[PDB]
Amino acid sequence: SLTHRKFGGSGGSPFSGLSSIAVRSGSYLDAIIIDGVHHGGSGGNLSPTFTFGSGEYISNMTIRSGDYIDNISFETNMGRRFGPYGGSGGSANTLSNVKVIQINGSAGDYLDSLDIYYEQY
Amino acid sequence: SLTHRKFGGSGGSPFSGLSSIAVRSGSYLDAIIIDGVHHGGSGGNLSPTFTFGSGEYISNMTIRSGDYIDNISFETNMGRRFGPYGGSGGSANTLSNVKVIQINGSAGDYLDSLDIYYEQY
Numbered sequence: 001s002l003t004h005r006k007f008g009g010s011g012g013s014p015f016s017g018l019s020s021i022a023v024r025s026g027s028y029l030d031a032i033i034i035d036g037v038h039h040g041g042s043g044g045n046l047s048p049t050f051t052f053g054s055g056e057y058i059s060n061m062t063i064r065s066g067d068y069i070d071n072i073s074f075e076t077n078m079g080r081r082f083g084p085y086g087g088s089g090g091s092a093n094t095l096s097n098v099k100v101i102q103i104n105g106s107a108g109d110y111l112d113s114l115d116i117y118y119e120q121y
Numbered sequence: 122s123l124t125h126r127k128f129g130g131s132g133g134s135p136f137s138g139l140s141s142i143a144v145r146s147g148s149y150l151d152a153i154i155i156d157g158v159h160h161g162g163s164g165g166n167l168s169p170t171f172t173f174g175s176g177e178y179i180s181n182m183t184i185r186s187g188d189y190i191d192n193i194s195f196e197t198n199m200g201r202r203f204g205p206y207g208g209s210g211g212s213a214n215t216l217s218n219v220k221v222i223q224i225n226g227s228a229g230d231y232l233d234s235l236d237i238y239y240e241q242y
């Protein structure tokens with residue numbers, strides 16, 4: 001189970017460890033690039049990079065998947081969008097009214113899977 | 122509800138969105154640097170960067186804090202240690218037998234606070 005703990009005082013401006021996302025994609029997601037770190041293979045084409053502002057987070061997301069991640073799109077709490085990138089294989093699954101905290105996953109030559117850590121509202 | 126969800130298939134090798142950590146420190150934590158992205162001020166001295174290997178995550182952490190983050194130390198499941206860095210002020214608190222998932226927080230000229238998301242085992 002996901003939990004959290006706060007340490008420290010009340011000062012300063014908020015930040016998140018999740019800074020940016022890009023992907024390489026063709027018919028599948030070949031790779032996801034998190035904070036500049038490449039996870040996956042060398043196929044497909046490189047998307048533009050989406051950089052989160054302060055206070056910004058993924059609030060809704062659609063992931064198409066089967067054996068691999070086929071496609072990703074998301075929208076933030078500030079009305080910004082990323083994607084869709086990828087193909088039309090697999091089946092869709094959507095998250096709505098969330099706050100994504102972290103993106104982990106598994107990868108080889110492709111992005112096999114995403115493990116999304118989030119608050120569900 | 123804090124939760125997580127897996128999308129996709131069974132293949133590939135796990136990765137984390139939290140790839141590396143460094144700090145600037147003196148008597149306090151001046152800054153935390155997450156996947157190279159700086160949060161905090163330019164005081165103190167810059168630590169080496171700690172980069173997580175495959176299958177490696179933070180398993181134990183000690184944070185000293187008061188009005189700021191005074192000190193951080195952690196150990197991974199592979200037995201590698203980071204820190205301690207910072208000073209001897211504040212009060213200590215420890216996470217034990219965890220998997221750290223994400224590090225968020227707040228910062229100004231110093232690291233004011235951390236919000237650590239983790240699984241407790």
Ligand SMILES: OC[C@H]1O[C@@H](O)[C@H](O)[C@@H](O)[C@@H]1O
Pocket residue numbers: 025026027028029030043044045
């Ligand atoms: O995304 C999976 C594959 O889709 C194909 O259409 C592209 O030509 C490849 O480079 C890519 O690896």
Ligand SMILES: OC[C@H]1O[C@@H](O)[C@H](O)[C@@H](O)[C@@H]1O
Pocket residue numbers: 028065066067068069070089090091
């Ligand atoms: O996720 C990659 C592929 O997995 C297969 O199991 C599905 O049948 C395809 O629709 C999908 O494109």
Ligand SMILES: OC[C@H]1O[C@@H](O)[C@H](O)[C@@H](O)[C@@H]1O
Pocket residue numbers: 107108109110111112131132133134
């Ligand atoms: O990413 C697609 C695949 O790439 C291969 O190189 C890995 O060994 C598989 O486990 C994985 O399913």
Ligand SMILES: OC[C@H]1O[C@@H](O)[C@H](O)[C@@H](O)[C@@H]1O
Pocket residue numbers: 146147148149150151164165166
């Ligand atoms: O970490 C708090 C402060 O500690 C002092 O010992 C250092 O000289 C400063 O550069 C630093 O900003």
Ligand SMILES: OC[C@H]1O[C@@H](O)[C@H](O)[C@@H](O)[C@@H]1O
Pocket residue numbers: 186187188189190191210211212
């Ligand atoms: O965290 C910065 C400082 O906060 C104060 O509230 C504590 O009394 C000090 O011990 C600590 O060094």
Ligand SMILES: OC[C@H]1O[C@@H](O)[C@H](O)[C@@H](O)[C@@H]1O
Pocket residue numbers: 010011012013228229230231232233
């Ligand atoms: O980070 C320590 C301090 O730096 C200042 O610049 C900010 O205005 C304070 O909110 C913060 O507590």
